[PDB]
């Protein structure tokens, strides 16, 4: 939403929007899951330790 002014909204912007922000959301989900899982394993092993 940098240059999305009234003059040039675009006809390919929506496709383009998915290409940007869609990727970010997917990545965020992946990172979040990875982080929770990592810690869980660490804790279990520490207890085991």
Curated annotation (Swiss-Prot):
Side of membrane Extracellular, spans: 1-16
Protein localization: Membrane
Superkingdom of origin organism: Eukaryota
TM region positions: 17-37
Tissues expressing this chain: Expressed at high levels in heart, skeletal muscle and ovary. Moderate levels are found in brain, tongue and pancreatic islets. Low levels are found in lung, testis and adrenal gland. Expressed at very low levels in stomach, colon, thyroid and pituitary.
Similarity-based family: Belongs to the ABC transporter superfamily. ABCC family. Conjugate transporter (TC 3.A.1.208) subfamily.
Function: Subunit of ATP-sensitive potassium channels (KATP). Can form cardiac and smooth muscle-type KATP channels with KCNJ11. KCNJ11 forms the channel pore while ABCC9 is required for activation and regulation. Can form a sulfonylurea-sensitive but ATP-insensitive potassium channel with KCNJ8.
Subunit (UniProt): Interacts with KCNJ11. Interacts with KCNJ8.
Descriptive protein name: ATP-binding cassette sub-family C member 9
Gene source species: Rattus norvegicus
Portion of the full sequence shown: 1015 to 1063 of 1545
């Amino acid at each position: 939403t940098s240059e999305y002014s009234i003059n040039d909204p675009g006809k390919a912007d929506q496709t383009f929007y998915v290409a940007g922000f869609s990727i970010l959301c997917g990545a965020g989900i992946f990172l979040c899951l990875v982080t929770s899982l990592t810690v869980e394993w660490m804790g279990l092993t520490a207890a085991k330790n």
